[PDB]
């Protein structure tokens, strides 16, 4: 019943603001409906938004890179990589690698999200970083699963 | 003297250059990639008092590589139980540049994790590995 829409709800659940929620929702939905979209425009826009924590930008950046055709432009942006590089925390990095290996064996959104839902926001974000480094390591659905668990954990944290 | 070979090690990777570390202040812009993080990591050991974490935190990442991160964390644990220069450097030598670099990012965030000597070993082991 549409994973894109589920992913959007999870993404928006970590966007504080109110005005940004609407702005993010519009962009995700345009992307979903194939409407006029351009990845460089989205990223630049995302990068310059106020209020959104670096982490949220990393997550939205990852989701746009995953959902936006507009590639053939070997992406990998600084702000996305930095916000998802973990943060010098050994424990989150160790867990991120362990989750990452489990996700490579998953093939569905549901299986990926359930496994990832037990991990901490920190390791989930580091894990998103590993996958950002090579989006093909897992399937799109699995990547979506991970994004959603990450959002749940950030939302449930504070 | 330890700051001597560390200084040559620190300049073991540099691309003409102009030394900068003689033994406070700030940045250094213009060019210089990963080395920037390394150098910065160095300064953070030879410039503050008895903060920032600019491009230090970014260059000393694991570059989205699963194996480097994996290794970097296992090295990190070891370098914590280590206590001398050469020893830490010895061990760090059995790991790759990527791993070594990722290990430096960890140490950074919590410098107090490893002694200045050990960290220096990591540095040299890293540069030696890099330059090589």
Residue numbers in the entry:
A (entry chain A): 1 to 158
B (entry chain B): 2 to 16, 20 to 27, 45 to 71, 75 to 156
What did the publication describing this PDB structure actually write?
The matrix protein 1 (M1) of the influenza A virus is a 252-amino acid protein, comprised of an N-terminal domain (165 amino acids; N1–165-domain) and a C-terminal domain (87 amino acids; C166–252-domain), and plays an essential role in structural integrity, replication and budding of the virus. In the mature virion, M1 stabilizes the two major viral surface glycoproteins hemagglutinin (HA) and neuraminidase (NA) by forming a matrix layer underneath the lipid bilayer of the viral envelope. M1 also directly interacts with viral ribonucleoprotein (vRNP) consisting of viral RNA (vRNA), RNA polymerases and RNA-binding nucleoprotein (NP) and mediates the import of vRNP for vRNA synthesis in the nucleus of infected cells.
In the present study, we report a unique low-pH crystal structure of the M1 N1-165-domain of A/WSN/33 (H1N1) that shows a significant rotation (44–48°) of one of the monomers, resulting in a distinguishing dimer arrangement from previously reported low-pH M1 structures (vide infra). We have crystallized the truncated N1–165-domain of M1 using low salt and low pH (∼4.7) conditions in the space group P21 with unit-cell parameters a = 54.30, b = 37.35, c = 94.97 Å and β = 102.4°, and one dimer (monomers A and B) per asymmetric unit. Monomers A and B are related by a non-crystallographic 2-fold (perpendicular to H6) symmetry to form a dimer; placing the monomers in a face-to-face fashion that brings the two basic faces adjacent to each. The dimerization is maintained primarily by hydrophobic interactions between the symmetry-related helices H6 and to a lesser extent between helices H9 and loops L9, augmented by hydrogen-bond interactions involving Asn82, Arg101 and Asn133 of monomer A to Asn82, Asp94 and Gly88 of Monomer B. Monomer B shows significant disorder at the N-terminal domain containing residues 1–81 (H1–H5), and as a result residues 1, 17-19, 28–44, 72–74 could not be modelled. Figure 1 (D and E) shows analogous electron density maps of monomers A and B that illustrate a typical disorder in monomer B. Even the N-terminal domain residues that were included in the model show significantly higher than average B-factors of 92 Å2 compared to 67 Å2 for the C-terminal domain residues 82–156; similarly, the average B-factor for the entire B-chain was 78 Å2 compared to 38 Å2 for the entire A-chain. Importantly, helices H1–H5 seem to have unwound, with H2, H3 and H5 becoming unstructured. No other M1 structure shows such an extensive disorder, although residues 69-77 are known to be weak or disordered in other M1 structures. Although the unwinding of the N-terminal domain has not led to exposure of the H1 and H4 hydrophobic residues, this observation for the first time may indicate beginning of a domain rotation that exposes these residues as proposed by Sha & Luo.
